[PDB]
Design a protein around this ligand. Structure first.
Ligand SMILES: Cc1cccc([C@H]2C[C@@H](O)[C@@H](O)[C@@H]2N)c1
Length: 330
């Protein structure tokens, strides 16, 4: 089997991407944030504290003939940006772009943090990291991909995120028309439950490539590119007027600037992030100070190849017995 679904930026900055997902019988379609940095599929629901729902579409398990309460199961998750959610668990039929999994764990939110409430466009998350990170207790549950894998034509999914435009998540096949040149594959460590890999280095604009190992995760659920302070300093030094602002919470730059590209290494291959991908607009409405899309990972504990990097590439998440990651230009 295969699946193919369009993923769409939630706003003009590509802050996140939503993908429609069919849950239950008859189908209830929710727009979920596909997140290769986590492993829970959770949704706003009829069980979510009423005051914490503000415009989201909710899953109502009582209206699904295939929904079953997973007795005694609870979940609770906190993300890297400080947001969180928790609740109980159902199993139900879940379909993405024509690909169907029966008995998928659908984690129903009873509580969500303010940042989820305030984002009316995201109805929940669909985790695509390794199932070892799944927070369901006392019986850990499998991701949608993990459940689908055996049935897929090939045990892979691909992320093809657009810049200010729709893109595609495919399951079970590689669309050879969706990228240019070749796909370069690179080793993955699953020890932390992430799609963790090692970039071979970087370049700023037309500058010389610096060969240096940068360990990080491929994370579709993170907006920006988070890299070591040395690398980030080298980038923003090429932008006149750019500076790190503790009050704003990262590097900012004059909105009148022209940003240089940023290149990262995948083996001997190179992925080029165009300068305008790194522009996240005024820090507040009407400001002439703009927020940078490349930021220091120093306070995180890990480097993150988030959407700013991934949307510059066609990315293969290869879930073979020994997982690997593939990157192509597009
Ligand atoms: C501080 C700031 C200013 C302008 C824009 C942002 C973006 C960057 C990324 O973290 C996303 O979640 C934010 N909406 C952040």
């Amino acid at each position: 089997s295969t699946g193919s679904a369009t993923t769409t930026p939630i706003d003009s900055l590509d802050d996140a991407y939503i993908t429609p997902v069919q849950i239950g019988t008859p189908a209830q379609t929710l727009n979920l944030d596909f997140d290769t940095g986590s492993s829970d599929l959770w949704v706003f629901s009829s069980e979510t504290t009423a005051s914490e729902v503000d415009g989201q579409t909710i899953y109502t398990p009582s209206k699904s003939t295939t929904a079953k309460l997973l007795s005694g199961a609870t979940w609770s998750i906190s993300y890297g940006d400080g947001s969180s959610s928790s609740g109980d668990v159902y199993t139900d039929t879940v379909s993405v772009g024509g690909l169907t999994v029966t008995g998928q764990a659908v984690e129903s939110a009873k509580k969500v943090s303010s940042s989820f409430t305030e984002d009316s466009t995201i109805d929940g998350l669909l985790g695509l990291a390794f199932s070892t990170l799944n927070t369901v207790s006392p019986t850990q549950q499998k991701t949608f991909f993990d459940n689908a894998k055996a049935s897929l034509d090939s045990p892979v999914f691909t992320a093809d995120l657009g810049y200010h435009a729709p893109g595609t998540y495919n399951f079970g096949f590689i669309d050879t028309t969706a990228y240019t040149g070749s796909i370069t594959y690179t080793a993955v460590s699953t020890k932390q439950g992430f799609w963790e890999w090692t970039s071979t280095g970087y370049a700023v604009g037309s500058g010389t490539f610096k060969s240096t190992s940068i360990d990080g995760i491929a994370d579709t659920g993170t907006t920006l590119l988070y890299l070591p302070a040395t690398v980030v300093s080298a980038y923003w030094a090429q932008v006149s007027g750019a500076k790190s602002s503790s009050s704003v919470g990262g590097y900012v730059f004059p909105c009148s600037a022209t940003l240089p590209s940023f290149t990262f290494g995948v083996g001997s291959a190179r992925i080029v992030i165009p300068g305008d991908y790194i522009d996240f607009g005024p820090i507040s409405t009407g400001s002439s100070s703009c927020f940078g899309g490349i930021q220091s990972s120093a306070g995180i504990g890990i480097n993150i190849f988030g959407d700013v990097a991934l949307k510059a590439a066609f990315v293969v998440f290869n879930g073979a017995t020994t997982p690997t990651l593939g990157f192509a230009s597009k």
